[PDB]
């Protein structure tokens, strides 16, 4: 597409985290990786290097107090990123406190939550 | 700098507003009235002038069947409700699951050639509802006024071979409540009386967890009985009709229909999807639409689908509180995203490629 963050998505092995902010996909500062605002929703792309190729897992993480615009946008952005990656990503819904062990294991220090978040776009 | 308009066209009601809002600012009946003796009136106005108009529903079971009247509904939407120039806003419109190709093309032609919209997008109602629930995979049970559908969706996209349609929906239940109230001596039969009974239904009905047991307990006392004040000031009392009415969703034979109930239909829909994705469908049964608003529906559907499904499956029925407008809200979210600009069809694309562009783009 033309979204600058799509253009960066899945180019190298690693971990990319975006936060939904007012109907947009905004990179999370790397210093804050692993700490999630309970008031927000996030999209996470884990890229792994195989026999040449790259494998993709997309997780959308929903804080217990995130607003419906944020959780809805997280879901849609996940679909759109997958489409941009030619459908090759596996999508995972991650709910605060019930995350998959695969998602937790992306973070050496473990998943942590914080109070607050960005205001809804409604 | 331009805000999209979101229009959700239903058999019973139109929901309309602006992208980025949490709810439609305009909701009105999908009715067009024309003089009995001769041009048209739409929505609430038409109902107030029922005495001098022939009233028609241009959308039947979620499908447009009268295009002239539907254009009157859209003109009413833009000019009388929103007061927006359609030629100056992108428009997101919704469509029923399994909407015929020809209908999608005709809707596209009307938007681009009658309303001159600069851009448009058509979304499937059930998919927008799933997104509004924060999910990309699940099965949506959408039940409105004219039609019910079960729509399995995987990683963002509906699975067309598994979509079920059940024409039983809210209007059938309104009509059935009108029928069984004759047991108590009520005669609700006119168009206006039907609107009264619809409201009684919404106010007083509920879905029993176990119908046979609810019949037995309701007969043992008058605790079932609840009252409702009619427009004219009289008070009506309703008893087991409160849960017998929406029971028809699970037992269509109450209506003389051979159709499967909504629990069976949801089960059958999930089974049409391959065994490797059914867990995520059973675990994400998402309710949508006004006729899923009955108290008790989630508990009843959970019990009934658990009985039907393999005992190794985990059933979870999700009942979002704003699910009456979750189609509209999903469209509002989708059309607000930074990325939506590249999803729509422009008029110049339409002008070069004609209405068939809609299929490649939506
Ligand atoms: N609280 C409620 N309890 C029961 N039924 C309700 C409630 N609120 C609304 N309804 C019913 O929901 C129906 C309208 O729902 P909705 O707006 O989802 O349908 P629609 O989009 O007009 O129709 P369709 O989706 O069938 O084309 C009506 O039958 C109405 O009586
Ligand atoms: Ca937030
Ligand atoms: Ca995929
Ligand atoms: Ca509808
Ligand atoms: Cl079972």
Numbering used by the authors:
A (entry chain G): 3 to 52, 54 to 125
B (entry chain A): 5 to 42, 52 to 375
Give excerpts from the publication.
Gly115 in PfActI is located in the P loop of SD1 and is Thr, Ser, or Ala in other reference actins. We previously generated a mutant G115A that did not rescue long filament formation in the absence of jasplakinolide but showed slightly longer filaments than the wild type in its presence. We crystallized the mutant using the same conditions as the wild-type PfActI with either Ca2+ or Mg2+ to compare these structures. Unlike the wild type, the C terminus of G115A is more ordered, with interpretable electron density up to Cys375 in the Ca2+ and up to His372 in the Mg2+ structure. The G115A mutation straightens α3 and moves the P loop slightly away from the C terminus. This in turn favors a cation-π interaction between Lys114 and His372 (3.7 Å) and a hydrogen bond between Glu118 and His372 (2.8 Å). In the wild type, the position of Lys114 does not allow both interactions to take place simultaneously, which is the likely reason for the disordered C terminus. Trp357 and Phe353 are in a double conformation in both structures, the former facilitating a recently identified cation binding site. The conformations 1a and 1b of the A loop are evident in these structures, but conformation 2a is not visible in the Mg2+ structure.
